DNA sequence: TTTAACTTTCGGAAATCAAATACACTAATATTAAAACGCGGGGGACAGCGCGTACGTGCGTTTAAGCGGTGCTAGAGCTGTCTACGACCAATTGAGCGGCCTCGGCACCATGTGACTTAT
């Protein structure tokens, strides 16, 4: 059952209490973002714990925006989200757009 | 062995008491700018639909993610020690606007001497 399996999947990671992005990717991503933001001479270290908190804030915001963008698609009487759709959802939420 | 709560005080705060404005509202008033009744309307937003479509839906072979050792070192956090730097006091100013004065210049009465005159 495609719908049954995928909806069950929503519910199980919906009630899962934990972060879910790939980790070594996320860590190297923040590392290179700091490296490019930082310059020639001053370089910055990262422990486990900062990377932690960064991750949780990113997860929480993107999931919140995710229900909102899903909802703007629902308001379009559809179930795909698009560029314009979410672009807007976020931008209506205001920050960073 | 180090983070508290006894205390032992005290001198600015936070009450009080008071009257000095002064402002809010509770309110007459004719006007009069906008309200709100009242019928079409365009216009549009939704019913219904074909078929193109686009993101899932479904398999194969990859790829990275995740461990799992292997350092090693860059800072963490901590400096034990010397000031500097700023928080206080005050003096060390000052300028601005009232205060006295004090300049000189008027109007007015005093004082002496040169005529002259006269009775010495």
UniProtKB/Swiss-Prot annotation:
Ubiquitinated. Is degraded through ubiquitin-mediated proteolysis when not protected by its association to the kinetochore. Residues 1-97 are annotated as: H3-like. It is found in: Nucleus; Chromosome, Centromere. Changing residue 65 to S: In CSE4-110; impairs nuclear division by disrupting the core centromere structure. It comes from the Eukaryota. Changing residue 62 to Q: In CSE4-111; impairs nuclear division by disrupting the core centromere structure. Changing residue 44 to S: In CSE4-102; impairs nuclear division by disrupting the core centromere structure. Belongs to the histone H3 family. Histone H3-like nucleosomal protein that is specifically found in centromeric nucleosomes. Replaces conventional H3 in the nucleosome core of centromeric chromatin that serves as an assembly site for the inner kinetochore. Required for recruitment and assembly of kinetochore proteins, mitotic progression and chromosome segregation. May serve as an epigenetic mark that propagates centromere identity through replication and cell division. Required for functional chromatin architecture at the yeast 2-micron circle partitioning locus and promotes equal plasmid segregation. Mutation in CSE4 causes chromosome non-disjunction and cell cycle arrest at mitosis. This is Histone H3-like centromeric protein CSE4. The chain holds residues 133 to 229 of 229 of the full protein.
